[PDB]
Design a protein around this nucleic acid. Structure first.
Lengths: 63, 49, 49, 79
RNA sequence: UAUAUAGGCGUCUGGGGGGAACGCGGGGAAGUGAAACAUCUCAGUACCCGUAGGAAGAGAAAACAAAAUGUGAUUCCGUG
RNA sequence: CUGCUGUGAAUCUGCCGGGACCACCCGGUAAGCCUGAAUACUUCCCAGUGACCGAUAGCGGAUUAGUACCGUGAGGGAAU
RNA sequence: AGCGAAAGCGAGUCUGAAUAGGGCGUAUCCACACAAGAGUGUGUGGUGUAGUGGUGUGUUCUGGACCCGAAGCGGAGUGA
RNA sequence: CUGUGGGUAGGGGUGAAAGGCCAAUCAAACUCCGUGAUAGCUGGUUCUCCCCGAAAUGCAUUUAGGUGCAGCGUCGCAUG
RNA sequence: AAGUCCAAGAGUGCGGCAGUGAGACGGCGGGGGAUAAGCUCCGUGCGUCGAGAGGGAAACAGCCCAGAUCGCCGGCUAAG
RNA sequence: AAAACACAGGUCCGUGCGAAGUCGCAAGACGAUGUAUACGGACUGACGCCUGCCCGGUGCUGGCAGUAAACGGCGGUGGUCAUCCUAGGUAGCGA
RNA sequence: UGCACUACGAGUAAAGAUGCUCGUUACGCGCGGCAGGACGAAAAGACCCCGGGACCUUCACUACAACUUGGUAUUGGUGC
RNA sequence: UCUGAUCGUAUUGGGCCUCUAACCUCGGACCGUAUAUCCGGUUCAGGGACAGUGCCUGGUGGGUAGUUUAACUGGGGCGGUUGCCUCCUAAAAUGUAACGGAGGCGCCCAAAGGUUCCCUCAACCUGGACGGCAAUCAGGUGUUGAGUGUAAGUGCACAAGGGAGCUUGACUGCGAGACGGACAUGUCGAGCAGGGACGAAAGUCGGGACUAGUGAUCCGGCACCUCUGAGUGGAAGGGG
């Protein structure tokens, strides 16, 4: 059978032109009144996945 | 499976934005490669590409 | 409830652009502080909504 | 068979991060502390939580001043 | 019981049951997976009922399509 | 697209569709039917083939084989 | 050929009031200048970018999935 | 009391009620099928040599005899 | 700064494959216990066993000596 | 194998008749070829004793009259629901 | 039913030794008896804990049967 | 037009009363039928638009089914605990366990935040109507023993402690560089730009002396926006 890929993993991680996998950052969807803007600014944009999770993330994405 | 803790694919936010199924995407070509591929002539076209 | 979360809106832009907390048994009326409205680009008097 | 004990917080990793003679880039965290056991010196600022950081590249130099224990930064040479 | 019908009587034509798979229509689980579990999955599966034919079904646009002077019944394959 | 229960239209400036809905354009002409080929399968015969087995294997069954035997029965089931 | 949620633009692009900074991208390397010494850039020139299709092997996915082993669950039948 | 012939069938029967009996079995019979059920559990896993060679820790866990990541092995490439 | 440096078969980064995640005792510093336990929980670029044969402790995983490539009816020694 | 079940006896609830109840998706069946002196369900379990202060009215069967802790109340209080006579299986009676 | 020309004491050892250590005793092979050991045989401990299941209970959750309240279709006419 | 101000005026719901004709009757009589408590038909007698049944809709519902009912733990149970912060344990970097020893938190503040300027406490002694060891006053000692919203610790007399004035930086677009780290989280941050505050200026200000006061993802609200709109233009919906 064709190898199905994950869905929850293809909706949460992306790939760039060179080939790095990127994601978003948590803790930024509610209870935002008591978070200083420096904290939210840190939790913004798209960082790169941890080296410890690159294997699993690649497993899920290519399937 | 992470042993019962929330997995890496279930605790991170889902990405942002929609897909726009009506996207128009082009197969792009650079002027330099046309220059090197068409050294002596011109009259470039889609089939000439 | 004693300190409910409140939002502040620009009085000239009407763009709710600040949320904070405020006691209700200390100032039982609206709070008027002059914050920075980013749409206009100038400190405007915001008001409790 | 009971008590009230058993709770403790986490470890905050509060200590000196760069000792005398280390060459630090500007902004490097030098000392993480609660109050002011160390005090700011030249090219050193105190962060919000009393975290001392370097305001200029150079080497750390712990020294004292008026009964305080300060942390100073020396402008490194370019040989 | 009147109109008549149900019914009765006679006569001709047929059906009935079986069969390994394949078809169509209908009814329809649970083990299991979800590291529990009920939605969900398993699975419209197993099984059951009706009913064929050598195949069956479906078929001749109250269709797609997107401004293309577009394709022009259905079916079944490969892609997508 | 369809299934049950209510309500219930028009016949061509009619009606249906173009993924809520509205207007315009486009497509079609529902509530009637039939229709091969291209596809699925092998109870059973004709031939052949195997970098398949070779008697504890290959069919349960090269031998009284669904036999002996076991069970009230459904059923289980050898060895040579 | 990439960047963006996308419209879109394109060795740039997104954010942004910003020839402000930052992300992501511009195979890489080399030489020279212009800057710098908050960790190096910025330009120039050259250099040239390597994928894909079989097949072996090691993992892994869907399948019983290295082999053996429950108590029990469901369907249809058999038994006074 | 007993012969002969019958009837009641599985979430069902029958019960002067014992969770008794229903073909040597009953807190839900037997058979076949789904089915090679599933098992964080137990057991088993078959020829040789050469080279290297651990861990029994941290964090999280419907988690504590399981597992995920880190730590520690090995192989390859890069650096040195 | 040297040292080792035909090696530690070192370090780091990135990839294939792991296994491990039940430790035990002894020497030091400690908690709990009665400053009991072959008790229990920690720390220790501490050791050994685990996964380690040989010599001593009588026998005697963990103590002392010492890390087994093979052969010899050759020498020197450790602990004792 | 019993102290358990059953039992005859009793009490309550339901059922006015293809009844209630039960088996069936229904049709149908049993109940019952019975009819409230009967049938079903539930408790108790031969037999005996213990044990109501006495009838106006919330009301009831209705023709005024039952009735007993039918409902209080035991209170005056006979007495033993009997003359009159009070909206908790209850200390009536407290034997 | 792993073996076998299968002693005893005191030790040691996974802490209850035919098998190890040091000693003590014992000629080889049988027959009839006893039942103290071989942690004797038998039954993958029923006690206890962990995991799975089953059946039972309920003012656990979620459903369904059954009962039942309504609207409406069968469903109509007269009057007030 | 509606405005008078309620009279006629058309269909129409609800209630009541019935009626027969749908429908119902295991009430009777016949017929099919020789046989027949089946069944159907005809007829009379009763009910009757009720009932029963269909679709829809609420309620009761262990009658029945599918399942859940945590872990740690000096066995299990009972009892306690489970996240975050602060000490000691912890062996002078960091880290370090126990059902080890003590405590706190799930906030509060529109000023207790920003800035400018100024000041110094606690206690003791002296002597003064209430006044007392003790409210206020004066003087003298007083160097940190007072205070610091809130536990503890680290700090802070240069004050971070006490006052007064003005303000909202409890900002917007960012952030080189680091700490902590299985990962997800968590931290600190110079400096640039825009608009401000305070201060003559230098400059400080992206909440509070610091460390607790909190909850991922999914899903779904609300406001704004230049995004997208299933043929087109809108909208719906989606997006940021």
């Amino acid at each position: 059978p064709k190898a199905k890929t994950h869905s929850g993993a293809s909706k949460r991680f992306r790939r760039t032109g060179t080939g790095k996998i990127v994601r978003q950052k948590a803790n930024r969807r509610h209870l935002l009144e008591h978070k200083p803007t420096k904290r939210t600014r840190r939790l913004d944009g798209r960082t790169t996945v941890s080296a410890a999770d690159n294997s699993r993330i690649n497993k899920l994405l290519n399937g | 499976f992470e042993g019962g803790q929330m997995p890496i694919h279930m605790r991170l936010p889902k990405l942002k934005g929609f897909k726009n199924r009506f996207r128009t995407e082009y197969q792009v070509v650079n002027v330099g490669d046309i220059n090197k591929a068409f050294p002596q002539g011109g009259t470039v076209g889609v089939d000439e590409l | 409830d004693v300190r409910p979360k409140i939002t502040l809106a620009c009085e000239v832009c009407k763009h709710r652009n600040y949320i904070t907390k405020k006691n209700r048994r200390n100032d039982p009326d609206r709070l008027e502080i002059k914050k920075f409205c980013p749409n206009c680009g100038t400190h405007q008097p915001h008001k409790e909504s | 068979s009971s008590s009230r004990n058993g709770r403790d917080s986490a470890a905050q990793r509060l200590g000196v991060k760069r000792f005398g003679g280390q060459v630090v880039k500007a902004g490097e965290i030098l000392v993480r502390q609660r109050g002011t056991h160390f005090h700011p010196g030249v090219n050193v600022g105190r962060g919000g939580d009393d975290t001392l950081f370097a305001l200029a590249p150079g080497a750390v130099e712990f020294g004292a001043k008026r009964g305080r224990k300060t942390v100073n930064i020396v402008p490194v040479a370019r040989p």
